Amino acid sequence: KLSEQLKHCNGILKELLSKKHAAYAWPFYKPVDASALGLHDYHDIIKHPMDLSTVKRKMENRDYRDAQEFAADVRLMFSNCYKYNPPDHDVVAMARKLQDVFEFRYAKMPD
Ligand SMILES: COc1cc2c(cc1OC)CC(=O)N(C)C=C2
Known part of the structure; x- marks a missing residue:
């Protein structure tokens, strides 16, 4: 019931969550727990947190209307990491x- 392009997106998501x-994927599995990690400036610097569990929930709930x-959201997750942390x-x-x-793999999108 996902569009053909969203099927490919779901395949990518499954791969990013795979063993x-x-x-290198594990930091992105769940929302950053800023308090747990001692990153008490995280939510001052990152206005729009994103992580793969949130992307998975949004895919399951048919939140995404297109690829x-x-x-x-996947690039927002990486951008947040590049913004907050030293390079x-x-x-x-x-x-x-x-x-x-x-x-x-996103580049291999069917069209
Ligand atoms: C333990 O090292 C860290 C883990 C994490 C973060 C910072 C860390 O060290 C500075 C914050 C982050 O951007 N993400 C994606 C998740 C976890």
Whole structure:
């Protein structure tokens, strides 16, 4: 019942959550718990938090009307990481690796 393009998006999402990518995907599995991590400035700096569990809920609830809306949330999640963290931080290295997985497979969108 997902559109053909949203089926491809759901496939990508499943891959980002799969064991294959867990070594660098794990920081993006759930909403950043700023208080738990001691990041008491996180919500002053990041106005629109996003994470893969939220993307999954939105896909299941048919919130995304097209691939573009799905991709905007996945890229918002990476952008938040690049905005908050210094560019040489291990969490940013993990973001760059998972975004490479995302962008190369998003590029294979059926049309
Ligand atoms: C433990 O290292 C961190 C984990 C996380 C964050 C920062 C960290 O170290 C500075 C915040 C973040 O951007 N994301 C995606 C999730 C977890």
